[PDB]
């Protein structure tokens, strides 16, 4: 199937004393593989998946130097933005950045991203052409003008289409046993009476990977959205995901209702019905 590599960075200023709190995480699809936390003791980029542990010292030295360089840019950025927005040195502010690449089933470049937020709102983002910038406001327009004069997008496009894609293919190969394995959801239906004349039927999807999934209810073969509840997909904590969808039904009418599960690990969608007895 399709694959992606993404890095997420968050820097939060601490105006009372010292430098910002900086947290960086790298992902291959839905699997975290590296992390850096400015509050941790190592002061190094650390592994979070077994397939990355095999990389040598030159890799870890290089990723540590780069992640510390990203930390220092975010520290400077917090100061720059405070100035652009005419804000005081008293409050805490946040800068977030995300970048990465997507590849198709052939492992060839599909899309690249590189975007920023300030205090949780869009600041500047690289357009899908990987040549131009979207600046949300006049402060971001000042950054856009600087980045255009400095060939920033040229370097980003080279990284996103080349380096990013090449290393993604390497990680996919080294981590093939888990990264290229799809875990189809283990599904079941539970029944919870809400009174003597109504019940909730809850359709569960457990232990699946990747996180993307669709759960839908039908009544007499027609889509049902009323009296329905769908929880957000959530991590199980062992690398897999969970989700459930529920419907309130008149007791005795359970057999008209079917739950439909769609996931990359399923060649055909699954259909679930309540087993009464």
């Amino acid at each position: 199937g399709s694959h992606s590599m993404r890095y997420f960075f968050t820097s939060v200023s601490r105006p009372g004393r010292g430098e910002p709190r900086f947290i960086a995480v790298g992902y291959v699809d839905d699997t975290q593989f590296v992390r850096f936390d400015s509050d941790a003791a190592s002061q190094r980029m650390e592994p979070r998946a077994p397939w990355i542990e095999q990389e040598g010292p030159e890799y870890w030295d290089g990723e540590t130097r780069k992640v510390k360089a990203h930390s220092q840019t975010h520290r400077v950025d917090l100061g720059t933005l405070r100035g652009y927005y005419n804000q005081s040195e008293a409050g805490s502010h946040t800068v977030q950045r995300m970048y990465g690449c997507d590849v198709g089933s052939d492992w060839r470049f599909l899309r690249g991203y590189h975007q920023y937020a300030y205090d949780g709102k869009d600041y500047i983002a690289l357009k899908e052409d990987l040549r131009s910038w979207t600046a949300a406001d006049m402060a971001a327009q000042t950054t856009k003008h600087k980045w255009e004069a400095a060939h920033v997008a040229e370097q980003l496009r080279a990284y996103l289409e080349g380096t990013c894609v090449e290393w993604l293919r390497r990680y996919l190969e080294n981590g093939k046993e888990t990264l290229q394995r799809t875990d189809a959801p283990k599904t079941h239906m539970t029944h919870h009476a809400v009174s003597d004349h109504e019940a909730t039927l809850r359709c569960w999807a457990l232990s699946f990977y990747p996180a993307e999934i669709t759960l839908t209810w039908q009544r007499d073969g027609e889509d049902q959205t009323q009296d329905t509840e769908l929880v957000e997909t959530r991590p199980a904590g062992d690398g897999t995901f969970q989700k459930w969808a529920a419907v309130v039904v008149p007791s005795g009418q359970e057999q008209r209702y079917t739950c439909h599960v769609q996931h990359e690990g399923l060649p055909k969608p699954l259909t679930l019905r309540w087993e009464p007895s």
């Binding site: 890095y7 790298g26 890799y59 290089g62 990723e63 780069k66 992640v67 360089a69 990203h70 840019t73 400077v76 950025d77 720059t80 933005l81 800068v95 970048y99 920023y116 600041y123 500047i124 950054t143 600087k146 980045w147 920033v152 370097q155 980003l156 990284y159 380096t163 990013c164 290393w167």
Partner: peptide, 9 residues
């Protein structure tokens, strides 16, 4: 791997 690009706001 991370990028090795200087990109200040």
């Amino acid at each position: 791997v991370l990028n090795d690009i200087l990109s200040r706001l």
